[PDB]
Design an enzyme around this catalytic site. Structure first.
Site, PDB file in Angstrom:
ATOM      1  N   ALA B  63       0.822  -1.184   0.000  1.00 12.25           N
ATOM      2  CA  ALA B  63       0.000   0.000   0.000  1.00 12.25           C
ATOM      3  C   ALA B  63       0.863   1.243   0.000  1.00 12.25           C
ATOM      4  O   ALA B  63       1.893   1.300   0.626  1.00 12.25           O
ATOM      5  CB  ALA B  63      -0.944   0.021   1.216  1.00 12.25           C
ATOM      6  N   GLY B 103       1.984  -6.127   1.122  1.00  5.93           N
ATOM      7  CA  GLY B 103       0.714  -6.235   0.458  1.00  5.93           C
ATOM      8  C   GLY B 103       0.868  -6.660  -1.003  1.00  5.93           C
ATOM      9  O   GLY B 103      -0.026  -7.297  -1.566  1.00  5.93           O
ATOM     10  N   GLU B 106       1.184 -10.430  -0.859  1.00 12.32           N
ATOM     11  CA  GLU B 106      -0.175 -10.927  -0.619  1.00 12.32           C
ATOM     12  C   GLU B 106      -1.010 -10.911  -1.862  1.00 12.32           C
ATOM     13  O   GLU B 106      -1.802 -11.817  -2.114  1.00 12.32           O
ATOM     14  CB  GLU B 106      -0.859 -10.093   0.454  1.00 12.32           C
ATOM     15  CG  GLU B 106      -2.117 -10.769   1.052  1.00 12.32           C
ATOM     16  CD  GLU B 106      -1.834 -11.902   2.054  1.00 12.32           C
ATOM     17  OE1 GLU B 106      -0.610 -12.152   2.321  1.00 12.32           O
ATOM     18  OE2 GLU B 106      -2.842 -12.509   2.621  1.00 12.32           O
ATOM     19  N   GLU B 126       6.520  -6.097   7.163  1.00  9.49           N
ATOM     20  CA  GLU B 126       5.690  -5.392   8.150  1.00  9.49           C
ATOM     21  C   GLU B 126       6.171  -5.508   9.561  1.00  9.49           C
ATOM     22  O   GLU B 126       6.322  -4.485  10.207  1.00  9.49           O
ATOM     23  CB  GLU B 126       4.203  -5.796   8.061  1.00  9.49           C
ATOM     24  CG  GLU B 126       3.577  -5.257   6.773  1.00  9.49           C
ATOM     25  CD  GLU B 126       3.559  -6.239   5.554  1.00  9.49           C
ATOM     26  OE1 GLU B 126       4.244  -7.372   5.609  1.00  9.49           O
ATOM     27  OE2 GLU B 126       2.746  -5.845   4.574  1.00  9.49           O
TER      28      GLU B 126
END
Lengths: 252, 252, 252, 254, 254, 254
Positions: B63, B103, B106, B126
């Site tokens: 993100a 992300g 993912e 993260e």
């Protein structure tokens, strides 16, 4: 003492220390391990655990074959076999040499990261010697190895070597025996270079929904993650990124 | 536009197109991705999707770090992290170069087939930077890698390279960067040489019962499979076998 | 007869015997297989099963393409696809040569241990030929291969070779075709050198909680394990260890 | 310091009394009260002299109207509801004695009890939707499990209350009595619980609730550690001895 | 040999009668009776002439008080309760006819039935906690699924009985009748079950119970083999024919 | 074209009325009606002016007797039952107003509602086993979740009906009224639902039902997107403002 427990900075060392019985876990060792896990969970200075064992022949060959008023699962609770399951919420590195079998293998499989000496051999010899009780020492192997390889171990009771374990990703690293303590410590250093409450939360989330449908997992609210939002480390991660510097974690 | 979306024959290309931010997903890109998934699901001419990204440095770094009246999960819905889960019912090939992290990793893991350039690196940084929220970016790694390797990524935030990903079967193929678009297209061509409604049904069944006991899975009635029985393609498969010729699929 | 069934000592041989149809399973073979599984489960002299197939071209290419008053799942019940699931409670070794595809692959995947000739090829060609029904032939692949490799098979209908299957631990051993029967028998001998009721219990426990959360698994009471405590073999395991000799199992 | 008596906690024999005591706010639970309740549940679970808990509340108007309109997450009721923070399980059997308004988080709290005795003034409801509040997992899950489906939905979706008689009719409450008789009725229930073998009662509660939303076959094949541990207790032997000698057992909680 | 008549089993038309017949021990189930019951359930499941079962008990004092105070594991009730050994499922619809005391494992056994008719003397309870016994998975799981949450807990935790009227009120029992009318009332129920298409009844029972503790969406997407097999039966055709010719179907159980 | 009025759909203020209107077939649902119902549920879910639905039926004899004795799979009730095709969820709160016969797929359809008001002529049943029909997942799963276990089985296995008073007694229905009062009673319920904050009502419904067959601990740790989204709405602010200014909130559904 048959379990040696030490805190060095932010790493707790839990070391099996009965090499004369190939580190087979006595009832007294189970008491001492339970004390260790309690302290590990309760002490905010402990950010990671290295689970290790004395001697060259074996990490752990399982339970030592009377008789207790309370139910105690093998490994001071940690396996959840034979008594209530105790969960270690801090990230754990198992450093495994030599034989790692039966309950000893199950115990290693409770760790997050496993570093093995090139002498390591893993197996579940219970069927082969004609022992089985409680839920069986079979459920972690089914989750940590490919299906037919897990069944091979469980059903034949034959061991696999460190190289094969590494090949399937049962272990994260294989090193010479002389390098095992240092390798385990490199992994604990990596775990503690990450934000430790975030590491703990990630572990709790990953494992807390592992045997659920993905959709159930993705819709889960995990309390450690909720609580992370209010921490000093969480603010320190934003500050450090904003000031283009390395974060300095405090574990609060 | 920061997402480039094109339909070429029976393949939809959804391409991240903000290489100047290493394809970090902005709120606007999430809107455009949601439009893409909607069109992908609704248009019966689209039989497969290639998810790709512009530039050499990175497929996607997650993100882009205010602020929206609706909840939007990362990737126009596709991850189900941060908002309602959107499911892409068509088979998807992710073509991944360079960094594929957080992300972005993912998102790749939402694809069915993953082809990586030999420059690809996968990771979940993260914890290492001190961020964690919602359900965590941890649940797909637990399902797509061996247990201890997943935990290594999740807990240390260190990356693995394309060769290691291939070794564990996280990725289906590794090629030189120059060959990535063509390789991805070979996979989309294989998917579309199979009967496309049958492929869609198989995907829905496999994934719709993946975290259930096998017995529950085997007793499931899946609506796409039920509906396949009434299709023209289903009749075309029988005709073609009966006349010893190749079937010609129409997607109806 | 199109299924050849023999009991030799404590091993039952269930052999597909229609090589002229590449061992495609007819309705009559399904009847004979159901008789075999019934006898295998009910006869306490049978401690293990070797599932094999005649000829060099193929272990089994699935169902032979009317029409029955009862629902029969493919493989005399064993797959649970198309009818009630039959569980074989004895440990099973599949010896697979040549093509192992569709329902034939699913059938092999019902075994515990799989030994393959180096000619073996595994695949699920149903989508590619435009067939899909019931629950789909997809659920075992999702549980026995890495996620993206399973999806590759399921969605493209392309085969993988014995070496790749071995690499991921779908198969336990790969040997030359000439060595396949002997290799399968070595595995049955290992299974039967372990305590056979303990092996059966371990299999029932491992598989009976495989798609549940670990905590649910660990708190399960499995009847075969409970019943093992009262057996002669269980006493024989303690006696033999106490007298430092090899146990002699009787299967009671 | 000024809040230190807003939860009254007292141990009398083998019964712990956990009493909400801020009637001026209709026993809405403050952050301070959540701290005191968490202390209570910790003591209740740890102290082997406590065999049962009566959860009650001061005043006539209300048992509890929910949260009072912190950097650690605390679920409502010192953990007990599991809404807003980690779930705290009370392993001892609990009787809730409910008068007057029992609404929102207050109703959820009463629903954490095993046995509920209501004064005939009790009114139960979940007014959150009606006042336009909803957060976390929703205060809806226990209602769905403790009332008939359509009655639960009526409460959840309209936010209107039901009375004691209707609660009793559906078996949401175990007994309805006049307000004057409420303390004594709650104590009769606690005496019944403590006339049974207390470790067996605990173990039955843990088993029943621990597999409640699982398939029956899963429940039946569960091994529950409090049941396994019961086999080694003095009370287990005392039960056999007393039955063998046709006399009343005398339980010691060990 | 002396026990061989402690379970009375008889087939009359399409009804099997499985009757506990050791009233001198208040129909407490001995090991011998568990063997006979296991034979009964095997025959009930295998014999296609048996469309329904009435489970009943001799005497006026008690339907069954549980296990009578072996090297194979046998669950109580010839397998039927699944407590103490593998679960045996009776696939035919079952009516339990219950008089007098129905307690402990006896109550669990009645709860294995689909329809329960009680004499107005029936008293239901789970006295295990009260007498200080608890083992295996606990005799608690069916109560949690067949009574309202707080009523179930009351039984489980106090070990006190409820009467027939209260059981009927919560829909634990389907009908309450005078003791003289019990056999005949049970037979009316069995006649109703066997007036419906018997293979369809079986298949409905297997579906309902097979997904009972799963989410509704899982239940709705389940394929049940007895339902799939029903499409190929003579009774399925007979149903269509009879509806098409506006006449009563005549079922043959095939 | 001739069927285009067999479902009557009308929006009045914030209530949508979905009315089965083929009384000549006792409101048995044709394929055409399933198409119209699917259109209705699509509009109900998409249109933010619709806060609640009343599902009703024309005539005095029957609410709905099920499917009327296609190449796409369509579940009965335009998707709503999820039996025979994909499940369509109505996210708005729904009141079913039921008169006369409510049987088979018709009863399953009423059971999809959140609140059920019945005329005193209503009779509920599942006659499929009795007429010898059973397919798909069975019309059994909602009954098991909305009635007491043994009452549900009685319906499922005998195929006999129960009356309105008995349905009300078990809390299958929320209210029973004379047939003349049925429309108005259904509207009172819809007014109660729409007096609460409509997005909060929706979110409560999604939460309650979305975790209904899961263990309570799973339910309590669920994050529900409609609840998360509610925090950003105008109605959420309006609730706080109105409580702060001791006035009635005025909801806008945004």
């Amino acid at each position: 003492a048959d379990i040696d427990f030490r805190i060095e900075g932010h790493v707790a060392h839990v070391r099996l220390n009965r090499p004369q019985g190939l580190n087979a876990i006595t009832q007294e060792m189970d008491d001492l391990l339970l004390d260790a896990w309690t302290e590990v969970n309760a002490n905010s200075d402990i950010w990671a655990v290295v689970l290790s064992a004395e001697g060259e022949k074996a990490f752990c060959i399982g339970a030592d074959v009377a008789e207790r008023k309370t139910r105690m699962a093998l490994g001071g609770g940690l396996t959840g076999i034979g008594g209530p399951l105790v969960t270690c919420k801090k990230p754990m590195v198992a450093a495994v040499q030599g034989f790692c079998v039966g309950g000893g293998f199950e115990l290693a499989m409770c760790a997050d990261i496993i570093v093995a000496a090139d002498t390591a051999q893993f197996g579940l010899p219970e069927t082969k010697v004609g022992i089985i009780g409680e839920c069986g020492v079979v459920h972690r192997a089914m989750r940590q190895l490919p299906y037919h390889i897990a069944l091979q171990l469980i059903l034949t009771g034959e061991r696999i070597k460190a190289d094969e374990a590494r090949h399937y990703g049962l272990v994260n690293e294989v090193v010479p025996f002389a390098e095992l303590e240092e390798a385990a410590l490199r992994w604990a250093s990596k775990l503690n270079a990450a934000s430790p409450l975030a590491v703990q939360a990630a572990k709790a989330a990953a494992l807390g929904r592992l045997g659920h449908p993905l959709e159930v997992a993705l819709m889960t609210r995990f309390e450690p993650i909720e609580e992370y939002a209010a921490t000093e480390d969480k603010k320190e991660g934003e500050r450090a990124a904003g000031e283009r510097r390395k974060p300095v974690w405090t574990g609060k």
